[PDB]
Design a protein around this nucleic acid. Structure first.
Ligand SMILES: [Zn+2]
Ligand SMILES: [Zn+2]
Lengths: 58, 58
DNA sequence: TTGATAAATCAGAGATAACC
DNA sequence: AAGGTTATCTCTGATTTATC
């Protein structure tokens, strides 16, 4: 479905297409992989860890 | 969108269709209307409020 | 093998509102 | 014009199948 949104890109990896918009502790629009990755390890997602796109499942 | 969900109906009004399945304190699924009504009033939505259909907005 | 991550996907809680 | 009922919108946390 729709991964975009009017005037928004991640406040970490700067993506404009995410299956779901999350939000960091400073209230800033981060994407899925950034919101998840942070919640888990507790350190920002590494830009080296930035792929090309998004996938599907089931 | 999807208004039904296999194996589920509202524990409070028995409807099988809703805009968003919620949960009561007992852990049972309840429809959007019943869940919101209880949160606002602290009493179960009465059967007298049950309506034939679901409306759409803007 | 197994175990730890990846991220989509699924939930649903709370917010915001439309509509009579 | 004001409000209650509850559709929708946002967003946080669990579930899941793959991938390392
Ligand atoms: Zn990002
Ligand atoms: Zn109900």
């Amino acid at each position: 479905s729709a991964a975009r949104r009017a005037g928004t890109s991640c406040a970490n990896c700067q993506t404009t297409t995410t299956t779901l918009w999350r939000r960091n502790a400073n209230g800033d629009p981060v994407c899925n992989a950034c919101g998840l990755y942070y919640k888990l390890h507790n350190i920002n997602r590494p830009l080296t860890m930035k792929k090309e796109g998004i996938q599907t499942r089931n």
